Design an enzyme around this catalytic site. Structure first.
Site, PDB file in Angstrom:
ATOM      1  N   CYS A 219      -3.001  41.819  -5.965  1.00 28.88           N
ATOM      2  CA  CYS A 219      -1.964  42.839  -5.545  1.00 28.88           C
ATOM      3  C   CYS A 219      -2.125  43.135  -4.240  1.00 28.88           C
ATOM      4  O   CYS A 219      -1.181  42.484  -3.332  1.00 28.88           O
ATOM      5  CB  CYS A 219      -1.993  43.873  -6.517  1.00 28.88           C
ATOM      6  SG  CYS A 219      -0.734  45.043  -6.152  1.00 28.88           S
TER       7      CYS A 219
ATOM      8  N   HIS B  55       0.489  55.807  -9.474  1.00 26.49           N
ATOM      9  CA  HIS B  55       1.675  56.439  -9.635  1.00 26.49           C
ATOM     10  C   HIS B  55       2.041  56.307 -11.048  1.00 26.49           C
ATOM     11  O   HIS B  55       2.855  57.150 -11.566  1.00 26.49           O
ATOM     12  CB  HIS B  55       2.834  55.045  -8.985  1.00 26.49           C
ATOM     13  CG  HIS B  55       2.984  55.297  -7.374  1.00 26.49           C
ATOM     14  ND1 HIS B  55       2.502  56.249  -6.805  1.00 26.49           N
ATOM     15  CD2 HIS B  55       3.327  54.202  -6.689  1.00 26.49           C
ATOM     16  CE1 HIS B  55       2.578  55.939  -5.704  1.00 26.49           C
ATOM     17  NE2 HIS B  55       3.084  54.670  -5.480  1.00 26.49           N
TER      18      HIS B  55
HETATM   19  N1  LIG Z   1       6.239  46.477  -3.169  1.00 28.09           N
HETATM   20  C1  LIG Z   1       5.105  45.878  -3.832  1.00 28.09           C
HETATM   21  O1  LIG Z   1       5.070  44.869  -4.484  1.00 28.09           O
HETATM   22  C2  LIG Z   1       3.790  47.079  -4.068  1.00 28.09           C
HETATM   23  C3  LIG Z   1       4.007  48.302  -3.692  1.00 28.09           C
HETATM   24  N2  LIG Z   1       2.879  49.143  -3.740  1.00 28.09           N
HETATM   25  C4  LIG Z   1       2.917  50.491  -3.079  1.00 28.09           C
HETATM   26  O2  LIG Z   1       2.721  50.481  -1.719  1.00 28.09           O
HETATM   27  C5  LIG Z   1       2.304  51.573  -1.439  1.00 28.09           C
HETATM   28  C6  LIG Z   1       0.885  51.514  -0.571  1.00 28.09           C
HETATM   29  O3  LIG Z   1      -0.354  51.352  -1.497  1.00 28.09           O
HETATM   30  P1  LIG Z   1      -1.779  51.413  -1.274  1.00 28.09           P
HETATM   31  O4  LIG Z   1      -2.142  50.893  -0.067  1.00 28.09           O
HETATM   32  O5  LIG Z   1      -2.531  50.912  -2.308  1.00 28.09           O
HETATM   33  O6  LIG Z   1      -1.769  53.132  -1.180  1.00 28.09           O
HETATM   34  P2  LIG Z   1      -2.935  54.061  -0.250  1.00 28.09           P
HETATM   35  O7  LIG Z   1      -2.835  55.340  -1.173  1.00 28.09           O
HETATM   36  O8  LIG Z   1      -4.357  53.235  -0.350  1.00 28.09           O
HETATM   37  O9  LIG Z   1      -2.424  54.330   1.318  1.00 28.09           O
HETATM   38  C7  LIG Z   1      -1.329  54.990   1.435  1.00 28.09           C
HETATM   39  C8  LIG Z   1      -1.612  55.461   3.006  1.00 28.09           C
HETATM   40  O10 LIG Z   1      -0.516  56.088   3.334  1.00 28.09           O
HETATM   41  C9  LIG Z   1      -1.061  57.347   4.010  1.00 28.09           C
HETATM   42  N3  LIG Z   1       0.131  58.411   4.031  1.00 28.09           N
HETATM   43  C10 LIG Z   1       0.415  59.102   3.096  1.00 28.09           C
HETATM   44  N4  LIG Z   1       1.326  59.998   3.332  1.00 28.09           N
HETATM   45  C11 LIG Z   1       1.774  59.928   4.726  1.00 28.09           C
HETATM   46  C12 LIG Z   1       2.527  60.101   5.626  1.00 28.09           C
HETATM   47  N5  LIG Z   1       3.636  61.191   5.339  1.00 28.09           N
HETATM   48  N6  LIG Z   1       2.658  59.867   6.700  1.00 28.09           N
HETATM   49  C13 LIG Z   1       1.707  58.729   7.232  1.00 28.09           C
HETATM   50  N7  LIG Z   1       0.797  58.419   6.333  1.00 28.09           N
HETATM   51  C14 LIG Z   1       0.913  58.832   5.102  1.00 28.09           C
HETATM   52  C15 LIG Z   1      -2.057  57.945   3.264  1.00 28.09           C
HETATM   53  O11 LIG Z   1      -3.054  58.592   4.051  1.00 28.09           O
HETATM   54  C16 LIG Z   1      -2.574  56.336   3.052  1.00 28.09           C
HETATM   55  O12 LIG Z   1      -3.583  55.965   3.898  1.00 28.09           O
HETATM   56  C17 LIG Z   1       2.182  52.532  -2.587  1.00 28.09           C
HETATM   57  O13 LIG Z   1       3.334  53.239  -2.726  1.00 28.09           O
HETATM   58  C18 LIG Z   1       2.199  51.213  -3.535  1.00 28.09           C
HETATM   59  O14 LIG Z   1       2.704  51.989  -4.983  1.00 28.09           O
HETATM   60  C19 LIG Z   1       1.563  48.746  -3.662  1.00 28.09           C
HETATM   61  C20 LIG Z   1       1.388  47.257  -3.982  1.00 28.09           C
HETATM   62  C21 LIG Z   1       2.289  46.148  -4.325  1.00 28.09           C
HETATM   63  O1  LIG Z   2       1.535  47.694  -7.430  1.00 32.03           O
HETATM   64  C1  LIG Z   2       1.828  46.847  -8.080  1.00 32.03           C
HETATM   65  N1  LIG Z   2       3.312  46.768  -8.423  1.00 32.03           N
HETATM   66  C2  LIG Z   2       4.094  47.568  -8.014  1.00 32.03           C
HETATM   67  C3  LIG Z   2       5.352  47.125  -7.439  1.00 32.03           C
HETATM   68  C4  LIG Z   2       6.436  48.110  -6.948  1.00 32.03           C
HETATM   69  C5  LIG Z   2       6.740  48.876  -7.928  1.00 32.03           C
HETATM   70  C6  LIG Z   2       5.636  49.645  -8.349  1.00 32.03           C
HETATM   71  C7  LIG Z   2       4.546  48.555  -8.961  1.00 32.03           C
HETATM   72 ZN   LIG Z   3      -0.834  47.175  -6.718  1.00 41.54          ZN
END
Ligand SMILES: NC(=O)C1=CN([C@@H]2O[C@H](COP(=O)(O)OP(=O)(O)OC[C@H]3O[C@@H](n4cnc5c(N)ncnc54)[C@H](O)[C@@H]3O)[C@@H](O)[C@H]2O)C=CC1
Ligand SMILES: O=CNC1CCCCC1
Ligand SMILES: [Zn+2]
Ligand SMILES: NC(=O)C1=CN([C@@H]2O[C@H](COP(=O)(O)OP(=O)(O)OC[C@H]3O[C@@H](n4cnc5c(N)ncnc54)[C@H](O)[C@@H]3O)[C@@H](O)[C@H]2O)C=CC1
Ligand SMILES: O=CNC1CCCCC1
Ligand SMILES: [Zn+2]
Ligand SMILES: [Zn+2]
Ligand SMILES: [Zn+2]
Lengths: 374, 374
Positions: free
Chosen positions: A174, A51
Site C-alpha cells: 500500500c 479512516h
Molecule cells: N489514493 C490511494 O490509493 C491511497 C490514499 N491514502 C490516503 O493518503 C493519505 C495519507 O496516508 P498516510 O501517509 O498513511 O497518512 P499519515 O497519517 O501517516 O500522514 C498524514 C500527514 O499529513 C499531516 N497533516 C495532517 N494535517 C495536515 C495539515 N492541515 N496540513 C499539513 N499537514 C497535515 C500529518 O501531520 C501527517 O504527517 C490518507 O488520507 C490515506 O487515507 C492512503 C494510501 C492509498
Molecule cells: O489505503 C488504502 N486504500 C485507500 C484508497 C483511497 C480510498 C481509501 C482507501
Molecule cells: Zn493504505
C-alpha cells in the site's frame, strides 16, 4: 495440518466505529473456488485503516480491517493457478481481474471488481469467510489483513520473490507503492523539476522517493508536524515548510519560493483545503497536481475553474496508478535489486497484539509506519 | 502615405456594458518601438467578445474588442524584425514573448505577458494607441481587432502564408485553433476513443474536428440548440444529444451510452454546472476532461474530489495549448495544405458595419461563426 479445515486464530475485530480494535479468536473458513488462504506475517498500519475507525471511510461493520501486508499461502481453492501453498504473497486491496474495461485499458488500474466505491465487505462471491463470537464478520477491501489468517480472491493476491523480507515488503502492499507511483506514474515527474509534497507520513515520504527517483531537482515537503522534517530530508526533500509557522496562506509562500509555482504538487493528507492549496501552488500554465489523500465522506470542495483554464492539470489516483497484480511483483523485484529503500519508512515494529498502541502512535504523530508482526 | 502618421478610421467601440457596439471614427497612432500597425481585413465574432459585453469577462472600458482576425501590415515601429509592411499576419491575443518561464517551457503557452489574467487594456508599455472623440480607448487582449487599423506589440503578431485567404484564416486566430488544440494537444485524444463535446459553437465544432483528426471512433455532441446538430454531424459527430430532451441529468445519459463513461470530455460553453457534468461523464478510472469554456468572472464551482481520486484527469487550456507565435503560421500552412477545413464553421459573412447584427446572430443561436469584412 490445516488444509481443507477451519482455522481458529487471533484477529483484530472492529465492532463499531470510534472504538479500539479488539483482539479476538475468530474462525477462518477454508478457501472456496478461486480463493487463497494466507498466513499473515507482517501488516502495516496505514492511515486508511484509521479512516475506518473514525468514520472517514465507510465500510460495513463489524469488520476485520488491514490492507497493507505480506504473508505465506497456506492453501488454495479449486481452480487456482497463480499461487501455491508456501508461496510468498502480498494481498491486493485493488484487485486486477484482467477482464474488465479498466483492466484492459493501458493506463487505468481501478479494477471494476474493487470493493471501495460501494463497499459490500465481502468476498467476490458476496459472502464471508470469518466468524467471531458466532457472528459473521465483514471483510475489508477483499484483504482483511488484521488477522493471523485471511482468505482472499485470486484476483486480489500477487506472488512475490521467495527471498523477500516480509516485514519490509508489506509496504509495497500500500503505502510505498501508492506514493511512489503517484510520482513516477501518475504525475510523471520530470528531471530537474520542482515538486511540493503535502503530507509527510508513509505515503508522502514515498512520494518524495518517487520524485527523487524521477530526477527532481527540488522537493518541498509540507507538514504541520515538524518532527517529520528530518526524515523527509533524508529521503529527498530539499526543504520543508510548516503551515503553522506562517502569517499567510502556504500557497503564496510556495509560489514565491518556486518563482511562480511548482512543476508538480501532491496532496497526501486528506483535506479539502490542502487539495485546493496544492493545485494553486503549481505553475498556472503547466503545473500538475495529484490528489492522493482521502477526505471525509461526501463533502464537496469549492474552487475556481480558471485555475485549470490557465493550463493546470488536476488528477487523482488509487494505488499510485499501478495495475496491482502486474506491478506488485515487479516492485518487489526492484526492492530486491536495491532500486529503492523501505527501511526509512519504518519507525516502529510491534507485535500484532499491540495494534491499538500502533494506532496511537499514528494519531499522535510519533510514527511514520508501524509494522505489526504476527 | 500613412506611415508615421495618425490614421483616422472606423472602429467598433464599446463604451459601457450591455450596450450595442458603437461604430465610431477613431484615431490610431503610429506604432512605437517594437509595435506593428495592421490593416484588418477580416475578423470573426467569438463568444469571448460577447462576454465583454455581458460582463462575463471583466476588462477595462471603454474598449475596442476583437481578437480573432487576419490582416496586412501597414507599418512597423523601431526595432521590429519579424514582420514587414505588406505581410499577411494574424494578431495573437495570447502573446509569445519567448523569454518568460512559460515561453521557455516545452509545453506551456500562457505567456506571462498576457493581458488576460489581470487586464490593463493597454499595449505592453501601459498606454493606448486609440483615441475617440478626444478620449483614450482601451485595447483588448493586446489585439483590438474591431477596428480598420490596430496596433499590436511584436510578441502579439505572427506572419503567415502570403497567399492565405484572410477571410477564412482569421479563425486560426482563435476559434479553430482553440478547439482543435484542446483535443489534439491538451487532451491528447487517442485513436478509437469515445469523446463527448459540450457546446457546438465555433469552438466546439473545432473540438470535434480535432477529435476526428485524432482518430476517435465515437463523438457525442451535446447542445440545447438542436439546430446545431446537423453541422456537428457534418464535421464528425456520430451522435448528438439535447439535455432539454431528458428527465435524467445528462451525465447519466452519457455514462449509459458509453458503457460506463467516455474517454475524453470537453466543456466548450462556459457554465459551472456543465464543467462538473463533463468531468463526471468521463470514465472514473481513466477519463480525461478538458475545460475550454469561460464562466462568469470569478465564480467558483462545487465538486466532489472523489471524482478525481478514482483516476480522472481534469485540465484546462488557453488557445488550445498552442505557443502562439510558433504555431499560428504552421496552422495556416496546414490549412493551405488541406489538412483541415474552415468553411464548415462559417455561417455568415457580413460587412463590419453590421457588427451588431452579427452579435445578434450569435446570441439567438443562428450562427456558428460570422466573419466581418472591412
Ligand atoms: N489514493 C490511494 O490509493 C491511497 C490514499 N491514502 C490516503 O493518503 C493519505 C495519507 O496516508 P498516510 O501517509 O498513511 O497518512 P499519515 O497519517 O501517516 O500522514 C498524514 C500527514 O499529513 C499531516 N497533516 C495532517 N494535517 C495536515 C495539515 N492541515 N496540513 C499539513 N499537514 C497535515 C500529518 O501531520 C501527517 O504527517 C490518507 O488520507 C490515506 O487515507 C492512503 C494510501 C492509498
Ligand atoms: O489505503 C488504502 N486504500 C485507500 C484508497 C483511497 C480510498 C481509501 C482507501
Ligand atoms: Zn493504505
Ligand atoms: N480557453 C480559450 O482559450 C478560449 C475560450 N472560449 C470560450 O469557449 C466557449 C465557446 O465559445 P464559442 O464557441 O465561441 O461560443 P458559442 O456561443 O458559439 O457556442 C456555445 C454553445 O454552447 C450551447 N449551450 C449553451 N448552453 C448550453 C447548455 N446548458 N448545455 C449545452 N449546451 C449549451 C450553446 O447553444 C452554443 O451552441 C465560450 O465560453 C468562450 O468564451 C473561446 C475561445 C478561446
Ligand atoms: O476567446 C478568446 N480568448 C479567451 C481566453 C479565455 C478567457 C476569455 C478570453
Ligand atoms: Zn478488472
Ligand atoms: Zn475567442
Ligand atoms: Zn512569454
Amino acid at each position: 495440518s490445516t488444509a481443507g479445515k477451519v482455522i481458529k486464530c487471533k484477529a483484530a475485530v472492529l465492532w463499531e466505529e470510534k472504538k479500539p480494535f479488539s483482539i479476538e479468536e475468530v474462525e477462518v473458513a477454508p478457501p472456496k473456488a478461486h480463493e487463497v488462504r494466507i498466513k499473515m506475517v507482517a501488516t502495516g498500519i496505514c492511515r486508511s485503516d484509521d479512516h475506518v475507525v473514525s468514520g472517514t471511510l465507510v465500510t460495513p461493520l463489524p469488520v476485520i480491517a488491514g490492507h497493507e501486508a505480506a504473508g505465506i499461502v497456506e492453501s488454495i481453492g479449486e481452480g487456482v493457478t497463480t499461487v501455491r501453498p508456501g508461496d510468498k504473497v502480498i494481498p491486493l486491496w485493488t484487485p486486477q481481474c484482467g477482464k474488465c474495461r479498466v483492466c484492459k485499458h493501458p493506463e487505468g488500474n481501478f479494477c471494476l471488481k474493487n470493493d471501495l466505491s460501494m463497499p459490500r465487505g465481502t468476498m467476490q462471491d458476496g459472502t464471508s469467510r470469518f466468524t467471531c463470537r458466532g457472528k459473521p464478520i465483514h471483510h475489508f477491501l477483499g484483504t482483511s489483513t488484521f488477522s493471523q489468517y485471511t482468505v482472499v480472491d485470486e484476483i486480489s493476491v500477487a506472488k512475490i520473490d521467495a527471498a523477500s523480507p516480509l516485514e519490509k515488503v508489506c509496504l509495497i502492499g500500500c503505502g510505498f507503492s501508492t506514493g511512489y507511483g503517484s510520482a513516477v506514474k501518475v504525475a510523471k515527474v520530470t528531471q530537474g523539476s520542482t515538486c511540493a509534497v503535502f503530507g509527510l507520513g508513509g505515503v508522502g515520504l514515498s512520494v518524495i522517493m518517487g520524485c527523487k527517483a524521477a530526477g527532481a531537482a527540488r522537493i518541498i515537503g509540507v507538514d504541520i508536524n515538524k518532527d517529520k522534517f528530518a526524515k523527509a530530508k533524508e529521503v529527498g526533500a530539499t526543504e520543508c515548510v510548516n503551515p503553522q509557522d506562517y502569517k499567510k496562506p502556504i500557497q503564496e509562500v510556495l509560489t514565491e519560493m518556486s518563482n511562480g509555482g511548482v512543476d508538480f504538487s501532491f496532496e497526501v493528507i486528506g483535506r479539502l483545503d490542502t487539495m485546493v492549496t496544492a493545485l494553486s501552488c503549481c505553475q498556472e500554465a503547466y503545473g500538475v497536481s495529484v490528489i492522493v489523500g482521502v477526505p471525509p465522506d461526501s463533502q464537496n470542495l469549492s474552487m475556481n475553474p480558471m485555475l485549470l483554464l490557465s493550463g493546470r492539470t488536476w488528477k487523482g489516483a488509487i494505488f499510485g496508478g499501478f495495475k496491482s497484480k502486474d506491478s506488485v511483483p515487479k516492485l518487489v523485484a526492484d526492492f530486491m535489486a536495491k532500486k529503492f529503500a523501505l527501511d526509512p519508512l519504518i519507525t516502529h515494529v510491534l507485535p500484532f497484539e499491540k495494534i491499538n498502541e500502533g494506532f496511537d502512535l499514528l494519531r499522535s504523530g510519533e510514527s511514520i509506519r508501524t509494522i505489526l508482526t504476527f
